[PDB]
Amino acid sequence: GLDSHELARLHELARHSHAVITRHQDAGGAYPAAPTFSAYRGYAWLRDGSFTAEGISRYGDVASAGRFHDWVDGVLRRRRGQVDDLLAAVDRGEVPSNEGMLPTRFTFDGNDGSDPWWDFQTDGYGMWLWSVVTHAARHGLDLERWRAGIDVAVDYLLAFWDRPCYDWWEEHVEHRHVSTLGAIHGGLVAVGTCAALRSAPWSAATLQVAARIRSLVSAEGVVDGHLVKWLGSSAVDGSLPACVVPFGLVPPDDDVAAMTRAAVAKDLDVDGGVHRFAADVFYGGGQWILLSALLGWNLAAAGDTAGALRHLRWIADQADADGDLPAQVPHHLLHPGSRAEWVARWGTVATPLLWSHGMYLILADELGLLP
């Protein structure tokens, strides 16, 4: 579905995507989120990093992806005692506050980069489990390399999956977000169905909790046939297709999958560029490369190759003169009057955003376009 002109450009953007991710990977293995965006400089996220790692693993750079998993594993093993203490606190009936939870931002040396009172999230731990299992399966690797870190993440998620937290976008701490629940589900199903992990003490528990997540989403996370942004809401969020592919709450051909793709397209997709959510004022609420890629991936998986390609083309059209992909673009803004102040305070939008490049690699690979 691509001519020679398009193929050349898409192949080049794939090569550049691999290059810019690997050039910016920290010495210790972490992928930074956004090396030139002042507010994020020096920090790594498990969400961004796990999708980045999946793109790199699909591209075939086993060494780079493995170094990311090494970094995460080591960071998590260092939290073995913190997690054990949180679990013991729960067992005494003294549930920890958000201020005591595992962090969202990490420094490259594995310390808290931010205060979880203000940004407590559980999604990234679920994404990492999904990512590392998927990588090991793809490349025939022994998960014992990363197992002790996996154990920390699993124990943490089994205890805290049902807790309110901020969404992927750092909003609404009191709610339970369907794409967060979905990320956790994806990680738990990945480890619970992994033959290499068949004897883990938590093996059965992971699938039972994944079923509990699905029960909660069925009860409170589906309205008018589609997934919703958080339990008990009616609106959609652009992250929701991740609950289909890769996180697997429902198959791509499920009615809820189809209705969710359609709702996101109708409510949030403008000309191929997907918005996060209707109230988004962050930089005026622009169009996010990673969300267009996510929707495209989901369309490809459902057999809508043309729709996938349309989103791939839109993403490629957002690359700058160096091939770098921003977090978002302002071609359509949900709340235009809010943009300027973000630019004034934090500078221009993060470019490159490594996660944008990682998602581009995933979608390109789904469409058979990695050279």
Could you give the count of β-strands?
8
Name the structural class. Answer: mainly alpha
Number of domains: 1
Shape: globular
- Spatial arrangement of strands, main beta sheet: 1-2
**Most strands sheet:** 2 strands, antiparallel
Helix/strand order = HEHHHEHHHHHEEHEEEHHEHH
Rg from alpha-carbon coordinates: 19 Å
How much helicity do the residues have?
40-55%
Terminal CA distance reads 16 Å
Beta-strand content estimate = under 5%
PDB class: hydrolase
Keywords: Glycosidase, hydrolase
Assembly: monomeric
Entry title: Glycosidase E335A
Describe this structure in words.
- Its EC number is 3.2.1.205.
- One of its GO terms (biological process) is polysaccharide catabolic process.
- Belongs to the glycosyl hydrolase 15 family.
- This is Isomaltose glucohydrolase.
- InterPro entries: 6-hairpin_glycosidase_sf, 6hp_glycosidase-like_sf, GH15-like.
- By secondary structure, the protein is mostly helical.
- The chain has one domain.
- 51% of the residues lie in helices and 4% in strands.
- The chain has 14 helices and 8 strands.
- The strands form 4 sheets. Strands 1-2 form a two-stranded antiparallel ribbon. Strands 3-4 form a two-stranded antiparallel ribbon. Strands 5-6 form a two-stranded antiparallel sheet.
- Strand 5 and strand 6 form a beta hairpin.
